[PDB]
């Protein structure tokens, strides 16, 4: 299943967004959610990074808060604040959802893991269809 052990971070939630890509899109989403929540509202959680999916689970009950196919992840980024991570999913053909996280000490390891999953996945797909 998973490629690496789950990441203990805060899930800030998800919001619809207008476009599949852009650091401006994800920073707009982050500012909005941060302005409407406080740190005590944040959901401790871990992100399981598997070959084909990302799964977001509650901190140690490990209940499922979201599951996302790598093929429908259009974009990811670290926000202007180095703690923040977001990715955009194409929820449907014309529908985008931004999933957001607060990471300590920063978002480097999570973004790396998710980027690596996308790059592995793309080569696997080219290989399958060749």
């Amino acid at each position: 299943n998973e490629l690496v052990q789950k990441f203990q971070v805060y899930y800030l939630g998800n919001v619809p967004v207008a476009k599949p890509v852009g650091v401006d899109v994800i920073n707009g989403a982050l500012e909005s959610v941060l302005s409407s929540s406080s740190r005590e509202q944040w959901t401790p959680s871990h992100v399981s990074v598997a070959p084909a999916t990302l799964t977001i689970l509650h901190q140690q009950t490990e209940a499922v808060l979201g599951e996302c196919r790598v093929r429908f992840l259009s974009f990811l980024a670290v926000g202007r604040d180095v703690h923040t991570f977001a990715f955009i999913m194409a929820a449907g053909p014309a529908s985008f959802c931004c999933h957001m996280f607060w990471c300590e000490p920063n978002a480097a390891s999570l973004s790396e893991a998710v980027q690596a999953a996308c790059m592995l996945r793309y080569q696997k797909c080219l290989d399958a269809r060749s």
Binding site: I26, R71, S111
Partner: peptide, 28 residues
């Protein structure tokens, strides 16, 4: 100078990453 963690963070902050798996299936 800038460590490995650091250079990749600035990349992730400045451009993020567009998933080519998405575009691959999208172009179909």
């Amino acid at each position: 100078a800038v460590t490995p963690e650091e250079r990749h963070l600035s990349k992730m902050q400045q451009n993020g990453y567009e998933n080519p798996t998405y575009k691959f299936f999208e172009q179909m």
